[model samples]
Target chain A: QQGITFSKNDVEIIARETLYRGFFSLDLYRFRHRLFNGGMSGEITREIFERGHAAVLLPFDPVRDEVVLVEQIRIAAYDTSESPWLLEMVAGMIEAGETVEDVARREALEEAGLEVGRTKPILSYLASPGGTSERLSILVGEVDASTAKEDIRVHVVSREQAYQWVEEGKIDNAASVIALQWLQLHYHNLRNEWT
Target chain B: TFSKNDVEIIARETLYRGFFSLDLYRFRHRLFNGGMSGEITREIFERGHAAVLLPFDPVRDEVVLVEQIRIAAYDTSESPWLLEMVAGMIEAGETVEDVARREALEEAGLEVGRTKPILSYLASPGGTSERLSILVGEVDASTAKGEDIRVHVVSREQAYQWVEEGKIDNAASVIALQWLQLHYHNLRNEWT
Candidate 1:
């Protein structure tokens, strides 16, 4: 039986694609990816595929239901950008032998030492659909707010600049923003019962 | 990775089947993890079996969400605990519907009568070759025991209400589940 597969052929690199050569050293390539149509339509061209990966932002509050966020340096934005440090929800990439839910929980414990109770799935969309194939499976998790309080002086990782609790509002990290929005979108019923 | 011109057929033969993966893991920060402090992480061909969630329930007015530990996210420098729809991969001869059936039972521990397709898409577009099919379904949620550790059922209205009140949240689940809620009636009437 044939699985859901896109048999892409007739690949073409048209022009000399070049981006601004900055500190990051990005060498661009302008190419076309086409899928040869064997069934109905003749062919489809310029179908972009981002290297597959998943991202999750764990939303937790160690202070009276306050949310937890970690501020750390971003490698991609280290030199070129003004502030390389990011204030983000606990998040990570999808790896082999792991589930999205598992990623959410594991990230929470590692980054903040808080146990993830229940997850409210937020959204899965293209971060940059034009050039990349990164679909983010971002999530918000319920945490034991009172027990695991965030005291930067007491618990601070060397790499992490600090951790903060955002009561509400727009977050800088896209993953954090999405994760919080998901929690905002589903907190009541999620909190109705204890996990 | 290959380059080409128009009408080019870049072909390569693969010597294996089971190219797809169903993985599960528990991640932690390399510097952290109290006891899980170690530095042996692989980049290529690594993935975990994930629990996909949908906001659904017939008896209760809420969809159940599962929260558990994860490791892949730790590797990505984010919190590993992610909120997601209830989903499982097809095992051997099992169909997508079959995975959906078992996942609904195992993750939420509820029985979804019919598997309704909301829309299927790739979970991630880069790195791992992972794809997912999300279904909108209704389950008999009133029968779960109070002491159940694996599942939590929530109502759609209640969940959305939380969103409006700064309570309910989780991006993927919100989008997918709300989409399911809008199209639940349509999915229920499908021939399949």
Candidate 2:
């Protein structure tokens, strides 16, 4: 499955500079790479957003056959969906000295107020690779739905019900959407292993 | 989805405007149960939208992928390089398919043979207004070149294995791979 590996030697960064800095930052690059046809491409200038990364966890109770999802208002969504409030997996950004798994468990506690049991690695992917450098590490963890927070009002629904929401255009967040699709294909196998 | 009357955009101020822009929004929305909520302040990343296309050669049973460096990916892992499908931002006044075909040519040097829309998803709705349109497009390997990219052509099984091994780890690529795994057999009949 592994493809041909190339080191940093394959490409050249002619120039780089910080274009802007704030809560979010941007960097501009003037770079050139070896073309597949055996020549270097002319220098290309691209503005890359410096979004760090995050950990997303889909807390699933295998025994009860339920999953917990959180909802919050999103300002970026205007034309895509009717409502900007989206249902998403429990997630948080990775702070200093915290591993991805650590962030996952911590977010599960703060966002959903659930205690995570053993975790099963689902997959990791760049949230958006075009301009932003944000990648998301997704995992499905065993959880006890009985310990949620008071104001949270977590949506604890059956696996089937969750997928139904996806079908009905209710769940539009990428991480949760992909997680549900993965569960659709492999939940039975996970149930056999976890249960 | 809500109508225009549901959300009242009280004020919008540009916090930072660069290649990518960020704005502070103050607004209130009608609640699901009715009645408007209190005013809330939120920061929105205004990245617009993108088009991502996965090129599959049914006759060869192979998929085309490209490897590139991502600066944001450097925070999480040792390698910032990623393997992903051909993608580009959809500019104003351009159709989704136009961007898809143009990116395929510039990134992988391949022309889209036939294309089918798969799905549209929000990149990260919590903070970014980037909606992504995904499609499965066919390519002719004999004519394709890796102009600006080092395109790798691999068997569908090999690609799936890369995903299973967590090697091909990008959201758009992962979703597209899973989609292929789910619909390959059905799509095969449409190719011929």
Candidate 3:
């Protein structure tokens, strides 16, 4: 019942230029696309941010009805967050050779000292469709909250209690909010099997 | 002592400016291990800010949402016409509440009443300076357009059912419905 009304092929790319090439890059595009009403849009220009993609893991401990989350400084959120050290799902950028699943599991262990087991791919969504080309593939994995080599603090909270923070606005980080809520939305079914 | 002060900007150059802007930043920050690290460069997207609203009719247990193509999700061409909360960019306005109420009226052709602030977060801080605030307002969806936009008035439970089915996958859409799920009773009591 659902399908793409338009694809990249429909967009006429007039010119593409690298506006900035650095740690994070930006590209400038002059393009036009097929419109639903029937005509193409007037020439549109955008400077698209390209920081690449990442994978995030929300460690769910089914037996305990808890989820493991990590606290890290997000400098990108420095301008906005009351505290940039907002607890977030463990995330790692996709690098030279690591697969998306590899990155997610690796960071879950490194950042939160959580050893992940059975994982369910929730879905991948662009973090911000209009601003950047960055996307996040998220996973909910059964886990054991054991202590290990960790630089960041990990919070192990019950599923219900953790979701409380989200409603109270204490857990305002985007991925973390979605992860916690996802766990709650599937709490019964997730625990049914993972336990 | 490691805070914003630890980060020092060496240079910032505007790469582009239009409806949105982009800037390249070169800076150095104190390392967690010790002193300053080498200069780091990041291209930040200054996509501006937005106010997002999830319109609800408590009496009817219905919610209002809109659907439109998000160009960035074009790769997921199978179903890229995303269902999203009523939202619009901040129009240099004094309060985000104004933006939220305005979007409710503009996008859903519905008037909002007794709005409650839900939460706000940076849309994606890693590469963009974009930020957004989310609020839920009392709405009646029966009142009200098609300029490449379609409004859907669905039962709150059905809206959440879409979230479960992976039909509503945008970050904003997911977050709003989830927030409503957790806060539905509280909202019902307060609004009643």
Candidate 4:
């Protein structure tokens, strides 16, 4: 069975109005698309938030079998989570002229004080694409865990411990969970290839 | 080193008001090094909140998932039709759990049994003010009973294998499935 019913060409964008422009931009879109059964549906109006994209880094020490993560305050989670402070992978926005790999290593050094080594890609995914256009590229980089800081802000843990945290409700973000799952499934393979 | 009080909102402006709202703020917060930074202006999307349901049939070791066109998923995703957990935006009058129950029935055509919130997170903190909670719901996978919508009744490991291969790649579904892998053993004990 042919799966996809429509593509970018089938949907006609009628209008685009800029709603806001600060660090981020918001636009109101009006358009219609082809229906599976018949003709185009009635025009619909939707607002989209555009904040470019970001890169998430999950540092793994193949030598020591450890993972690197950071703890930071996210004011946005103030009302939703138990604490606005979140334990997450090293992440930063991807700027113009910068590759996703660059942002990942850059954020790792800036946030966790770790100079990451050869990086491997995990996946690129949209955060919540219902009304916003924010995408994230998740990667796992090789690091010297011996150099990792053990402090109040940065955490270096075993692959088993990280997955345990996910099970225990301590690690609750998208990128970290996805990266940890990937690590759980492939760490032994990575150890064989990299170390 | 910084708390909520360390941040100050100098001014807030409503930039847009539609089905969703956009607000711009001029604010500053205490920097990690120790001093307050200069005024920073930012616009954040106010897209409201939502709840996603992971319908699990513990007795059968199967999961019921829904597939539909998420037009917003059109750009980066290979298909706008995503294999996702049954989910909906939380309206004003309903609780997060209520939206989970309603969407489970409306999207997948399954009457859910007991439900509990398993995980919750802000989708992205930098640009959007949208947050969602995921519910682990009890269901009868046999009743997977839509237009363009497909109700997939998959074995637990089959779904996890798909997740492992990146076939099931949506954020909510990935998190929910990974969650199942970690919690399924305990959940089966509790539900069955």
Candidate achieving higher TM-score, 3 or 4: 4
lDDT of 4 by residue, A100-186 (tens): 999998888878889988999987777887787677889999999778761228888898999888767678777887788778878
**lDDT, candidate 3, A1-195, per-residue tens:** 232356566677688778767677677667677676777778877666777788988888788787887765555666665544567788989976778889988887778766778999876666777656677878998887544232356677787888888777667777888888777777899889776
Q: What is the lDDT of residue B71 in candidate 3?
A: 55
Off by over 4 Å in 2: A1-4, A9-18, A29-45, A145-153, A167-169, B1-6, B30-38, B75-78, B109-113, B190-192
TM-score of 1: 0.37
Best by TM-score: 4
State the lDDT of candidate 2 residue by residue for B122-153, as single tens digits.
98775678898888999886666663356788
Q: What DockQ would candidate 4 receive versus the native complex?
A: 0.40
Write candidate 2's Cα lDDT for A59-144 as tens digits: 98878788898876676776677876678899888877878899999889888778898998888887886677777888999987
Interface RMSD of each: 16.7, 2.8, 3.2, 3.3
Candidate 3 wrongly placed segments (more than 4 Å): A1-16, A29-31, A34-40, A95-99, A148-153, B1-18, B24-41, B77-80, B91-93
Instruction: Score candidate 2 by DockQ.
Output: 0.47
Superior by lDDT: candidate 1 or candidate 3: 3
Report the poorest 10 consecutive residues by lDDT, candidate 3 chain B.
B71-80
Q: After superposition, which runs of candidate 4 have C-alpha atoms over 4 Å from their true positions?
A: A1-10, A36-39, A96-98, A149-153, A164-170
Docking class of 1: incorrect
Give DockQ per model, in order: 0.03, 0.47, 0.45, 0.40
lDDT of 3 at A67: 80
Model 1 stretches with alpha carbons more than 4 Å out? A1-195, B1-55, B75-79, B145-149, B161-172, B184-192
What's the CA error at residue B121 for candidate 2, in Å?
1.2
